[PDB]
Short mmCIF file of all heavy atoms in Angstrom, two decimals:
data_model
loop_
_atom_site.label_atom_id
_atom_site.label_comp_id
_atom_site.label_asym_id
_atom_site.label_seq_id
_atom_site.Cartn_x
_atom_site.Cartn_y
_atom_site.Cartn_z
N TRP E 1193 63.91 88.92 15.22
CA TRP E 1193 63.36 89.49 16.42
C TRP E 1193 63.42 91.04 16.24
O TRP E 1193 64.41 91.61 15.83
CB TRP E 1193 64.15 89.11 17.68
CG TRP E 1193 64.04 87.65 17.94
CD1 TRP E 1193 63.07 87.08 18.74
CD2 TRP E 1193 64.79 86.69 17.40
NE1 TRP E 1193 63.41 85.77 18.76
CE2 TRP E 1193 64.39 85.47 17.93
CE3 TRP E 1193 65.87 86.65 16.50
CZ2 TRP E 1193 64.89 84.17 17.58
CZ3 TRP E 1193 66.37 85.38 16.05
CH2 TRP E 1193 65.91 84.16 16.73
N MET E 1194 62.27 91.72 16.62
CA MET E 1194 62.34 93.12 16.76
C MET E 1194 61.85 93.47 18.12
O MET E 1194 60.73 93.30 18.50
CB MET E 1194 61.36 93.85 15.74
CG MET E 1194 61.30 95.26 15.80
SD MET E 1194 62.94 96.04 15.69
CE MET E 1194 62.70 97.51 16.69
N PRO E 1195 62.76 94.05 18.94
CA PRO E 1195 64.21 94.33 18.84
C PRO E 1195 65.02 93.07 19.13
O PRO E 1195 64.55 92.04 19.72
CB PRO E 1195 64.51 95.37 19.89
CG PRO E 1195 63.46 95.07 20.94
CD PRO E 1195 62.26 94.55 20.26
N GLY E 1196 66.35 93.17 18.74
CA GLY E 1196 67.22 92.16 18.97
C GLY E 1196 67.59 92.21 20.49
O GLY E 1196 67.50 93.24 21.13
N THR E 1197 68.38 91.16 20.98
CA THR E 1197 69.05 91.19 22.20
C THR E 1197 70.14 90.18 22.25
O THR E 1197 70.46 89.68 21.18
CB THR E 1197 68.14 90.97 23.42
OG1 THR E 1197 68.70 91.33 24.67
CG2 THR E 1197 67.57 89.46 23.44
N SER E 1198 70.74 89.81 23.37
CA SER E 1198 71.88 89.00 23.47
C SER E 1198 71.49 87.53 23.44
O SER E 1198 72.25 86.67 23.94
CB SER E 1198 72.70 89.32 24.73
OG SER E 1198 73.31 90.60 24.66
N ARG E 1199 70.44 87.21 22.80
CA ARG E 1199 69.90 85.78 22.79
C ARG E 1199 70.81 84.83 22.01
O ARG E 1199 71.63 85.23 21.15
CB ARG E 1199 68.53 85.87 22.14
CG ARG E 1199 68.52 86.51 20.71
CD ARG E 1199 67.18 86.33 20.04
NE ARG E 1199 66.11 86.81 20.87
CZ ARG E 1199 65.59 88.01 20.85
NH1 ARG E 1199 66.16 88.98 20.17
NH2 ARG E 1199 64.63 88.25 21.71
N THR E 1200 70.55 83.61 22.26
CA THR E 1200 71.14 82.49 21.41
C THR E 1200 70.18 82.20 20.30
O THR E 1200 68.99 82.06 20.53
CB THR E 1200 71.47 81.23 22.26
OG1 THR E 1200 72.43 81.49 23.27
CG2 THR E 1200 71.82 80.12 21.38
N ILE E 1201 70.72 82.29 19.04
CA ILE E 1201 69.92 82.04 17.89
C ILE E 1201 70.32 80.72 17.28
O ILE E 1201 71.41 80.37 17.05
CB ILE E 1201 70.19 83.15 16.86
CG1 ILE E 1201 69.73 84.44 17.53
CG2 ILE E 1201 69.29 82.86 15.63
CD1 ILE E 1201 70.25 85.69 16.71
N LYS E 1202 69.34 79.83 17.20
CA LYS E 1202 69.54 78.57 16.49
C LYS E 1202 69.07 78.60 15.12
O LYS E 1202 68.00 79.28 14.80
CB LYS E 1202 68.90 77.43 17.26
CG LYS E 1202 69.21 77.25 18.68
CD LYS E 1202 68.60 76.08 19.28
CE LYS E 1202 68.98 75.88 20.71
NZ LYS E 1202 68.29 74.80 21.38
N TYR E 1203 69.80 78.00 14.19
CA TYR E 1203 69.32 78.00 12.76
C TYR E 1203 69.74 76.82 12.09
O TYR E 1203 70.68 76.07 12.47
CB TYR E 1203 69.80 79.34 12.02
CG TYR E 1203 71.32 79.27 11.72
CD1 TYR E 1203 71.76 78.82 10.52
CD2 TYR E 1203 72.11 79.69 12.68
CE1 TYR E 1203 73.20 78.77 10.23
CE2 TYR E 1203 73.56 79.65 12.50
CZ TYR E 1203 73.99 79.17 11.28
OH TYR E 1203 75.37 79.23 10.96
N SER E 1204 69.09 76.45 10.93
CA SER E 1204 69.55 75.37 10.08
C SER E 1204 68.93 75.52 8.70
O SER E 1204 67.97 76.33 8.60
CB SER E 1204 69.14 74.04 10.65
OG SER E 1204 67.71 73.81 10.65
N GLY E 1205 69.40 74.80 7.74
CA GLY E 1205 68.91 74.89 6.48
C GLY E 1205 69.99 74.79 5.41
O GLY E 1205 71.06 74.27 5.65
N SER E 1206 69.64 75.18 4.22
CA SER E 1206 70.50 75.10 3.00
C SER E 1206 70.87 76.50 2.56
O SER E 1206 70.01 77.44 2.37
CB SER E 1206 69.91 74.34 1.91
OG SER E 1206 69.39 73.14 2.31
N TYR E 1207 72.15 76.78 2.45
CA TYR E 1207 72.65 78.07 1.93
C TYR E 1207 73.59 77.83 0.88
O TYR E 1207 74.65 77.21 1.07
CB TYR E 1207 73.17 78.89 3.13
CG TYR E 1207 74.00 80.06 2.57
CD1 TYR E 1207 73.33 81.21 2.20
CD2 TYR E 1207 75.31 80.11 2.63
CE1 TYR E 1207 74.02 82.38 1.77
CE2 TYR E 1207 76.12 81.16 2.24
CZ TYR E 1207 75.45 82.27 1.77
OH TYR E 1207 76.13 83.38 1.33
N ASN E 1208 73.32 78.35 -0.30
CA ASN E 1208 74.07 78.14 -1.48
C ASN E 1208 74.40 79.45 -2.24
O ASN E 1208 73.56 79.78 -3.08
CB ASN E 1208 73.45 77.01 -2.40
CG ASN E 1208 74.37 76.73 -3.56
OD1 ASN E 1208 74.43 77.47 -4.56
ND2 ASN E 1208 74.94 75.54 -3.53
N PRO E 1209 75.58 80.02 -2.01
CA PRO E 1209 75.95 81.23 -2.70
C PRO E 1209 76.73 80.95 -3.96
O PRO E 1209 77.56 80.01 -3.99
CB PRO E 1209 76.77 81.88 -1.65
CG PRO E 1209 77.49 80.73 -1.01
CD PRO E 1209 76.48 79.63 -0.86
N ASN E 1210 76.47 81.70 -5.03
CA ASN E 1210 77.17 81.67 -6.32
C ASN E 1210 77.64 83.03 -6.55
O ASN E 1210 77.16 83.68 -7.45
CB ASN E 1210 76.26 81.05 -7.46
CG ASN E 1210 77.07 80.89 -8.74
OD1 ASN E 1210 78.21 80.92 -8.75
ND2 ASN E 1210 76.28 80.68 -9.84
N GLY E 1211 78.63 83.49 -5.82
CA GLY E 1211 79.09 84.78 -5.91
C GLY E 1211 78.96 85.59 -4.59
O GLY E 1211 78.92 84.99 -3.55
N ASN E 1212 78.98 86.91 -4.68
CA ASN E 1212 78.87 87.85 -3.54
C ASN E 1212 77.64 87.60 -2.68
O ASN E 1212 76.46 87.92 -3.14
CB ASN E 1212 78.78 89.30 -3.91
CG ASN E 1212 80.02 90.06 -3.88
OD1 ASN E 1212 80.04 91.27 -3.37
ND2 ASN E 1212 81.14 89.48 -4.37
N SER E 1213 77.79 86.99 -1.55
CA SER E 1213 76.64 86.61 -0.69
C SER E 1213 77.13 86.28 0.67
O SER E 1213 78.19 86.04 0.90
CB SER E 1213 75.96 85.38 -1.30
OG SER E 1213 74.99 84.84 -0.41
N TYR E 1214 76.26 86.52 1.70
CA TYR E 1214 76.57 86.01 3.13
C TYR E 1214 75.32 85.55 3.74
O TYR E 1214 74.12 85.76 3.41
CB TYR E 1214 77.17 87.16 3.85
CG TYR E 1214 76.32 88.36 4.18
CD1 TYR E 1214 75.25 88.25 5.07
CD2 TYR E 1214 76.47 89.54 3.59
CE1 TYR E 1214 74.43 89.40 5.34
CE2 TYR E 1214 75.75 90.67 3.88
CZ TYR E 1214 74.69 90.53 4.74
OH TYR E 1214 73.89 91.63 5.07
N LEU E 1215 75.61 84.68 4.74
CA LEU E 1215 74.54 84.29 5.71
C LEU E 1215 75.04 84.71 7.06
O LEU E 1215 76.11 84.45 7.45
CB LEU E 1215 74.50 82.67 5.66
CG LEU E 1215 73.64 81.96 6.76
CD1 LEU E 1215 72.14 82.25 6.55
CD2 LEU E 1215 73.92 80.51 6.72
N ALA E 1216 74.19 85.49 7.75
CA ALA E 1216 74.64 86.13 8.88
C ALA E 1216 73.56 86.45 9.86
O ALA E 1216 72.33 86.70 9.42
CB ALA E 1216 75.43 87.49 8.60
#
Side-chain angles (χ1 to χ4, degrees):
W1193 297 263
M1194 179 59 209
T1197 193
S1198 289
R1199 55 172 52 89
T1200 293
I1201 300 165
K1202 304 182 177 177
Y1203 71 97
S1204 69
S1206 306
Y1207 165 78
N1208 184 283
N1210 183 13
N1212 259 226
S1213 170
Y1214 66 71
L1215 171 69

